A paper describes a structure:
Others, such as VH6-1-encoded bNAbs, preferentially bind group 1 subtypes and then increase in breadth to group 2 subtypes, similar to the VH6-1 clonotype B described here (Joyce et al., 2016; Kallewaard et al., 2016). Members of clonotype A preferentially bound group 2 HA, whereas members of clonotype B primarily recognized group 1 HA. In agreement with the binding profiles of isolated clones from each clonotype, the early intermediate of clonotype A primarily recognized group 2 HA, whereas the early intermediate of clonotype B was specific to group 1 HA. As expected given their HA group preferences, clonotype B was more prevalent after group 1 H5N1 vaccination, and clonotype A dominated after group 2 H7N9 immunization.
We describe two genetically similar VH6-1 bnAb clonotypes from the same individual that exhibit different developmental paths toward broad neutralization activity. HA is a trimeric glycoprotein that is critical for viral entry and is composed of a globular head domain atop a more elongated stem domain. The HA head domain contains the receptor-binding site that engages sialoside receptors on host cells and is highly diverse among subtypes, whereas the stem domain carries the machinery for virus-host membrane fusion and is relatively conserved. Two HA stem-directed bnAb clonotypes, A and B, were elicited upon vaccination with H5N1 and H7N9 from a single donor (Andrews et al., 2017). Both clonotypes were encoded by germline genes VH6-1, DH3-3, and Vκ3-20 with the same CDR H3 and CDR L3 lengths.
Author numbering:
A (entry chain L): 1 to 30, 30A, 31 to 95, 95A, 96 to 213
B (entry chain H): 1 to 31, 31A, 31B, 32 to 52, 52A, 52B, 53 to 82, 82A, ...
Write the structure that this text describes.
């Protein structure tokens, strides 16, 4: 019944900046019952602020809560890379017992970093089972935008690869990416040259890593 | 201090009942100054409070209005635990489930805050049976004098459902590890890679093992990754 609307949905700021995260309630919230949580990747939420303004034990002074009524805010002064997280507001009332806002994702901007690229042939163990996975790794880059192109004997591949990307590293704020090209064993043994070509803002020209089957 | 140990199946079939337990150490399930909650999280629905139980000279329970018919929370004082039972589950109940301590600091003037959260249990509401992964090495290749850094890893392929956990050298190798999100293949099985960068000079002397654990299938694999 009480809806909490957080804004902005995503915010990207540099270390040393200040962030203001807003939480707007659909009706008045008693100030003792408004809390804020921080959730870092792979972790459970952590209490940051309770009763609108009160820092939880051992939370740094850079985190501060404010507001009243319908409008609340979490301010983070002097951003650090480790503050990369999703921040949630939360309230309680007799009619709608506990509700959360949808979260604001605080991303960290850093200077451009080109990826380091590696290619991995399929293992002999896997070939024994009739399928071949070729993996291309893009390590520690920024920003997140990156294009990976697979070529087999210089023929561009389409439709036969999948990729996934890590969240920003809490220390150096980079991403890493893995792309897997999946072929049948028969198709894999029918070709020789396997190549991963990478395009990224931090590369003046694309980088290609390759190998020849049986070498 | 306080530990909240969660347990229960990671896979539940549609229409069946999803049960989880939270075993408390360092606090009392019947303490009259806290309350014991279940909260879940999904990418679509966000964080959703499900219910709570607490003792004030008798037991009380409160459930989210949308779930009041489908849910039950039961405390157990002899084992100092409390459990969640969610009936008639559908894929909308696929989520990470947390057990969570609620407290009112500076009561009676304060208000509720969720000050301790368990690690959380991913529950997938799906019909297929569990399947353990095959684990293949991602070998460092021709990277013995290629700048001093070698990348190696493990490909964790064809398992169901999520999650798998990957460590390196039984947790002794943590810096430089990236374990990527799984992707769902057209087969309906997941595939994931975990990589680490290491000094090229160490490849001859240092052993590197990825430890893969797939709890839903009781599968554990230790795979040594060696250079080509």
């Amino acid at each position: 019944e009480i809806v909490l609307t957080q804004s902005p949905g995503t915010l990207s700021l540099s270390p040393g900046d200040s962030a203001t995260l807003s939480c707007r309630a659909s009706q008045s919230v008693a100030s003792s019952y408004l809390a804020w949580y921080q959730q870092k990747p792979g972790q459970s939420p952590r209490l940051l602020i309770y009763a609108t303004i009160n820092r939880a034990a051992d939370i740094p002074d850079r985190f501060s809560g404010s507001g009243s009524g319908t409008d609340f805010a979490l301010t983070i002064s002097r951003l650090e890379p480790e503050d990369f997280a999703v921040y949630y507001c939360q309230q309680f009332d007799s009619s709608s017992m506990y509700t959360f806002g949808q979260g604001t994702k605080l991303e960290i901007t850093r200077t451009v970093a080109a990826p380091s690229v590696f290619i991995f042939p399929p293992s002999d163990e896997q070939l024994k089972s009739g399928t071949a996975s070729v993996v291309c790794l893009l390590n520690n880059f920024y920003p997140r935008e990156a294009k990976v192109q697979w070529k087999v004997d210089n023929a561009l591949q389409s439709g036969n690869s999948q990729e996934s990307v890590t969240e920003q590293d809490s220390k150096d704020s980079t991403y890493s990416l893995s792309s897997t090209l999946t072929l049948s064993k028969a198709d894999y043994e029918k070709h020789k040259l396997y190549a991963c070509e990478v395009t990224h803002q931090g590369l003046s020209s694309p980088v290609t890593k390759s190998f020849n089957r049986g070498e | 201090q306080v530990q909240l140990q969660q347990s229960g199946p990671g896979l539940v079939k549609p229409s069946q009942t999803l049960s989880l337990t939270c075993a408390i150490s360092g606090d009392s399930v019947s303490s009259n100054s806290v309350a014991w909650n279940w909260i879940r999280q999904s990418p679509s629905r966000g964080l959703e409070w499900l219910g709570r139980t607490y003792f004030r000279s008798k037991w009380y329970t409160d459930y989210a209005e949308s779930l009041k018919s489908r849910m039950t929370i039961n405390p157990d004082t002899s084992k100092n635990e409390f459990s969640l039972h969610l009936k008639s589950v559908t894929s909308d109940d696929t989520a990470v489930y947390y057990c969570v301590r609620g407290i009112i600091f500076n009561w009676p003037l304060g208000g509720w805050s969720f000050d301790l959260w368990g690690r959380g249990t991913l529950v997938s509401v799906s019909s297929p049976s569990t399947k353990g992964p095959s684990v293949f090495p991602l070998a460092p290749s021709s990277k013995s004098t290629s700048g001093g850094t070698a990348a190696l890893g493990c490909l964790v392929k064809d398992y169901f459902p999520e999650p798998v956990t990957v460590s390196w050298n039984s947790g002794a190798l943590t810096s430089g590890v990236h374990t990527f999100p799984a992707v769902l293949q057209s087969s309906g099985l997941y595939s994931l890679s975990s990589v680490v960068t290491v000094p090229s000079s160490s490849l001859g002397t240092q052993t590197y093992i990825c430890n893969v654990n797939h709890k839903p299938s009781n599968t554990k694999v230790d795979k040594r990754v060696e250079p080509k």
